[PDB]
Amino acid sequence: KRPEGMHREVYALLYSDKKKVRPWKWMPFTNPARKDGAMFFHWRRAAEEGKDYPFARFNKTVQVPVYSEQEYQLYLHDDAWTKAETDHLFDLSRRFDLRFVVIHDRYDHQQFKKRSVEDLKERYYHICAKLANVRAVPGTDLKIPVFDAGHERRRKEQLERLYNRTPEQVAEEEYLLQELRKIEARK
Amino acid sequence: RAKAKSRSSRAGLQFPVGRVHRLLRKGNYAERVGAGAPVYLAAVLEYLTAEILELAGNAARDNKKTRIIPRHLQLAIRNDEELNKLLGRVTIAQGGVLPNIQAVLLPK
Amino acid sequence: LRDNIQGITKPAIRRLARRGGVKRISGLIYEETRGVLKVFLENVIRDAVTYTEHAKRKTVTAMDVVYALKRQGRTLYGFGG
Amino acid sequence: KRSRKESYSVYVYKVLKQVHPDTGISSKAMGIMNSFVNDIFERIAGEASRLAHYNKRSTITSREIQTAVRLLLPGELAKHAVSEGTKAVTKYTSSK
Amino acid sequence: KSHAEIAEQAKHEAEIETRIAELRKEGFWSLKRLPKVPEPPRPKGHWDYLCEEMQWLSADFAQERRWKRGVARKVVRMVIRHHEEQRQKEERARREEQAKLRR
Amino acid sequence: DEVGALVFDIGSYTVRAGYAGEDCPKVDFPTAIGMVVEGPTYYIDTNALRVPRENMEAISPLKNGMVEDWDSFQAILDHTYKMHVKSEASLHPVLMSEAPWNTRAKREKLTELMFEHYNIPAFFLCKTAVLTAFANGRSTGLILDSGATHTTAIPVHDGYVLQQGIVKSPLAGDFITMQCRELFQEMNIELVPPYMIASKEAVREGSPANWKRKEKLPQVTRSWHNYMCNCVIQDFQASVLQVSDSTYDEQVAAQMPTVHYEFPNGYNCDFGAERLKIPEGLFDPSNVKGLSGNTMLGVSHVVTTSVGMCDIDIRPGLYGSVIVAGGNTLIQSFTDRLNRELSQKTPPSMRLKLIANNTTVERRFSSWIGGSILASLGTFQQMWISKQEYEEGGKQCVERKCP
Ligand SMILES: Nc1ncnc2c1ncn2[C@@H]1O[C@H](COP(=O)(O)OP(=O)(O)OP(=O)(O)O)[C@@H](O)[C@H]1O
């Protein structure tokens, strides 16, 4: 008699062609990445009690130099920038992970005159470059690539002139089509 | 609904079981197709493809080439015993032939 | 067109024979090869034009040639998409 | 207005890369490969259809496909393909 | 000349003049697109870690929601089939009665 | 990574409290609660709120996403803690949402009130725009939140809000309620709340309502009466109103199928173009009578102004990650009209795309889902303002610890 006892398709294909200890516990823990020693809680296992916080690796804050009073007074002096303003700019840079689009919004316009993004970026890069240009021994960062603010101002102006152009988009696209047309005709 | 799992992944194949079943069901082959037929067909096709690809890659490494070209396919097919029988009546473009010179036409 | 079978010259036929392993070739072998190639192309292109006309198409696609070769037994890979 | 044509190149390259990490494949070789896949698909499906018609059955099943593979593939390739198909049909019905 | 091609040439010259005017106004292509952008990324940024895990768990909840509403869905579903199976259980008992009839 | 915490989203319309890590908030209850001097008492879950009780008094704890009465706010917090949360505050951190336009003074005062009164182990105060972005899965984009009090476009960049790019408009649920009130008064519909109805009978369409008034109604203040009437009006809005696909045209609106609705008192009638003419003011306030002002900006106008007030380099990201949220966004065809207007007004050079978070839970509870998934992250475990941080840095440490 047919043995079968298994799945129809598989069966036809095959024959027709012949100590518990490990409680999870609401354990407290501390994150070595923090400096305030704040204690949190987590449902850890019974094996990794007291083990380091695994996500502690995600603490590589952005790199930003820290000038001193004498260094600033000596080299970073600027007629159009004071300490009250430069320290705040660097604090914003350290706090918001070096994004100037947000540093400009967080700028304190009530105590300092209004600023753009390009001027702030230029000031920051000039500070970083001048801090290290005092000597050749520093190996961390010596030749900071100070970005171009002059050409950036143009890249801003002649692009904002294109942004808010309502019928000029269609006009330019149409004339560009006609341009390719007669250029191919004269080729 | 639950996270949809494809039949190819469920079986353990790479070839499209869904498209194979579509072809089988809409084709001349039969009125309706069972769920097991396209899986088996795709598995067999994938096995043949893996075999011929292994042989073609071996021929390519022998010829010192990183890209399998029709030469590496023709050489593989006509060097293998069973694949040659499978594709005897099949010609491959730009594949060439084997350097099979008859021993009687050699220098004497 | 006419007499385009002569576009298969003696060097071409001799290279085709070298690729087949022939060492020495005779004189009338070239005419025999031209005649055989013409007879083969006749059937292949007749099948292709039969697959084309039936499709009401004015261009002989590569799939028509593939189907003609399959009918004649010469399954050809590399032109089936 | 797109006229998109399908192919097996996305999976023929996956199998290629899993069976040979360092070796690639050209476009012409991929086309010949897809042609081979289509040809063998047609062969096996037609053989299964013939078996069904001979057994007076209107539906093709895994058993028809298995006997068709046994008939088509020669010698020590038939056995390999059949073992692969059998193992796949058993790992598929086990809900894994 | 074609007593028309010269007119087409004059029209093309007028088009060229209008395009020169439009270029003096606002230009056609703002050349020098981001040429001097040496902003060096931090050693690892450390903010992509948040963004990375952010994308990792954000899609998870969205997926788990659709899965949960799908899971609870099919649950209440087999519930309906079960109740149907109870009425279908009585119908199967009736079929067993009919099978005794047939015997 | 997960830690038992408490996520709070305190809006001007509803308050949503729950645990971090859940797809939905534990309890959502209206914010426009009443008051009764039993001292002043407050209610949650709407069952202790919508009760006819002696001497219902007015109160407004939080308006425009900002605390208006610290006493009522503390009472709401205590009630949410002991009634529905039913757990000590010292056992769970607190991640609370705040409006981007919240002041440093209110921020520090909320921080000190949470640290000296409830003794919570950790605290965090996040902006609603950042929370909505984190919920929708984007770090850069424009959050469009049309609440009960205002419709606001807030640009967030890399998880930070750009205050100078934020834009607000008063056209919100309050405006919709005012328009519904005006429509009822014009159509001669007596707005009768449920608490004044004892029994009613079925009457023909358009006929007067046949209902009986309760005989032992208690003393209720004009504020509580208006609250019940506004609840009825919001029900009418959710059940009737629909946004016009294109710019409102009277001819095309007079060719739309009417919608039938029955008020609590039994008066039942069908609405035609009047239900589509009201929601038009949200997009075009120039055609709204009693709003003789062109300085008001519609939804699309607010979006465009918020995108324009930002740096041109990030406008593409904002246009491509425009996120829509809020209760008012649930009106039929609202997002369709919004997408149409934005595709018409946005320069094609910048890709436009709206997230399809159209579900009710996804929309109204976006700011809470965001806080939940933000507190359920191991990385976020380092941004918690601890009790020790508060004790050492004082109330002002909030500004530096949580932007
Ligand atoms: N189903 C619905 N359909 C249409 N509108 C609704 C619906 N539910 C609520 N609303 C509207 O949503 C508004 C309140 O929603 P929401 O919860 O977004 O406000 P909030 O953001 O909590 O508080 P605020 O608006 O002060 O920030 C009310 O004005 C109400 O009219």
From Swiss-Prot, chain A:
Entry's localization field: Nucleus; Cytoplasm
Domain SANT, chain residue ranges per copy: 78-128
Covalent cross-link Glycyl lysine isopeptide (Lys-Gly) (interchain with G-Cter in SUMO2) as placed by the record, residue numbers: 143
Residue stretches in coiled coil: 154-187
Quaternary structure and interacting proteins, as annotated: Component of the NuA4 histone acetyltransferase complex which contains the catalytic subunit KAT5/TIP60 and the subunits EP400, TRRAP/PAF400, BRD8/SMAP, EPC1, DMAP1/DNMAP1, RUVBL1/TIP49, RUVBL2, ING3, actin, ACTL6A/BAF53A, MORF4L1/MRG15, MORF4L2/MRGX, MRGBP, YEATS4/GAS41, VPS72/YL1 and MEAF6. Component of a NuA4-related complex which contains EP400, TRRAP/PAF400, SRCAP, BRD8/SMAP, EPC1, DMAP1/DNMAP1, RUVBL1/TIP49, RUVBL2, actin, ACTL6A/BAF53A, VPS72 and YEATS4/GAS41. DMAP1 also forms a complex with DNMT1 and HDAC2.
Annotated function: Involved in transcription repression and activation. Its interaction with HDAC2 may provide a mechanism for histone deacetylation in heterochromatin following replication of DNA at late firing origins. Can also repress transcription independently of histone deacetylase activity. May specifically potentiate DAXX-mediated repression of glucocorticoid receptor-dependent transcription. Component of the NuA4 histone acetyltransferase (HAT) complex which is involved in transcriptional activation of select genes principally by acetylation of nucleosomal histones H4 and H2A.
Name recorded for this polypeptide: DNA methyltransferase 1-associated protein 1
Organism the protein comes from: Homo sapiens
Gene name linked to the record: DMAP1
Part of the full-length chain shown: 48 to 258 of 467
UniProtKB/Swiss-Prot annotation, chain B:
In-chain residues carrying the UniProt-annotated modification N6-glutaryllysine: 85, 108
Biased composition (Basic residues): 1-8
Chief subcellular location: nucleus
GO molecular function: DNA binding; protein heterodimerization activity; structural constituent of chromatin
Subcellular location: Nucleus; Chromosome
Modified residues (N6-crotonyllysine): 26, 108
Chain positions found as N6-succinyllysine: 85
Covalent cross-link Glycyl lysine isopeptide (Lys-Gly) (interchain with G-Cter in ubiquitin), where: 3, 5
Any Gene Ontology CC annotation: nucleus
UniProt-listed GO biological process terms: heterochromatin formation; negative regulation of cell population proliferation
Annotated positions of the N6-(2-hydroxyisobutyryl)lysine modification: 26, 64-65, 85, 108
Keyword Metal-binding assigned: no
Residue(s) carrying N5-methylglutamine: 94
Keywords on record: Acetylation, Chromosome, Citrullination, DNA-binding, Hydroxylation, Isopeptide bond, Methylation, Nucleosome core, Nucleus, Phosphoprotein, Ubl conjugation
Post-translational modification: It is involved in the initiation of both imprinted and random X inactivation. Ubiquitinated H2A is enriched in inactive X chromosome chromatin. Ubiquitination of H2A functions downstream of methylation of 'Lys-27' of histone H3 (H3K27me). H2AK119Ub by RNF2/RING2 can also be induced by ultraviolet and may be involved in DNA repair.
Modified residues (N6-(beta-hydroxybutyryl)lysine): 3, 26, 85, 108
TM ranges: none
Function: Core component of nucleosome. Nucleosomes wrap and compact DNA into chromatin, limiting DNA accessibility to the cellular machineries which require DNA as a template. Histones thereby play a central role in transcription regulation, DNA repair, DNA replication and chromosomal stability. DNA accessibility is regulated via a complex set of post-translational modifications of histones, also called histone code, and nucleosome remodeling.
Family: Belongs to the histone H2A family.
Name of the protein in question: Histone H2A type 1-C
Gene (UniProt): H2AC6
From Swiss-Prot, chain E:
HSA domain: residues covered: 34-103
N-terminal signal peptide: none
Compartment list: Nucleus
Disease field: Floating-Harbor syndrome: A rare genetic disorder characterized by proportionate short stature, delayed bone age, delayed speech development, and typical facial features. The face is triangular with deep-set eyes, long eyelashes, bulbous nose, wide columella, short philtrum, and thin lips. Developmental delay, hypotonia, musculoskeletal defects, and behavioral abnormalities: An autosomal dominant disorder characterized by developmental delay, speech delay, mild to severe intellectual disability, hypotonia, musculoskeletal features, and behavioral abnormalities including autistic features. Skeletal anomalies include joint hypermobility, chronic musculoskeletal pain, scoliosis, and pectus defects. Affected individuals also have non-specific and variable dysmorphic facial features.
Subunit (UniProt): Interacts with CREBBP and EP300. May be part of a complex containing SRCAP, CREBBP, CARM1 and GRIP1. Component of the chromatin-remodeling SRCAP complex composed of at least SRCAP, DMAP1, RUVBL1, RUVBL2, ACTL6A, YEATS4, VPS72, ACTR6 and ZNHIT1. Component of a NuA4-related complex which contains EP400, TRRAP/PAF400, SRCAP, BRD8/SMAP, EPC1, DMAP1/DNMAP1, RUVBL1/TIP49, RUVBL2, actin, ACTL6A/BAF53A, VPS72 and YEATS4/GAS41.
Designated name of the protein: Helicase SRCAP
Gene this protein is translated from: SRCAP
Curated annotation (Swiss-Prot), chain F:
Keywords: Acetylation, Activator, Chromatin regulator, Disease variant, DNA damage, DNA recombination, DNA repair, Growth regulation, Intellectual disability, Isopeptide bond, Neurogenesis, Nucleus, Phosphoprotein, Transcription, Transcription regulation, Ubl conjugation
UniProt entry tagged with the keyword DNA damage: yes
GO molecular-function terms, A-Z: chromatin binding; transcription coactivator activity
GO biological process: blastocyst formation; chromatin remodeling; DNA recombination; DNA repair; negative regulation of cell differentiation; nervous system development; neural retina development; positive regulation of cell differentiation
Phosphoprotein in keyword set: yes
Pfam families, per the entry: Actin
InterPro entries xrefs: Actin (IPR004000), Actin_CS (IPR004001), ATPase_NBD (IPR043129)
One GO cellular component term noted in the UniProt record for this chain: SWI/SNF complex
Phosphoserine: modified positions: 60, 207
CDD domains linked to this entry: ASKHA_NBD_Arp4_ACTL6-like
SMART domains (UniProt xref): ACTIN (SM00268)
Subcellular location: Nucleus
Similarity-based family: Belongs to the actin family.
Known function: Involved in transcriptional activation and repression of select genes by chromatin remodeling (alteration of DNA-nucleosome topology). Component of SWI/SNF chromatin remodeling complexes that carry out key enzymatic activities, changing chromatin structure by altering DNA-histone contacts within a nucleosome in an ATP-dependent manner. Required for maximal ATPase activity of SMARCA4/BRG1/BAF190A and for association of the SMARCA4/BRG1/BAF190A containing remodeling complex BAF with chromatin/nuclear matrix.
UniProt xrefs under PANTHER family: ACTIN (PTHR11937)
Organism: Homo sapiens
Underlying gene: ACTL6A
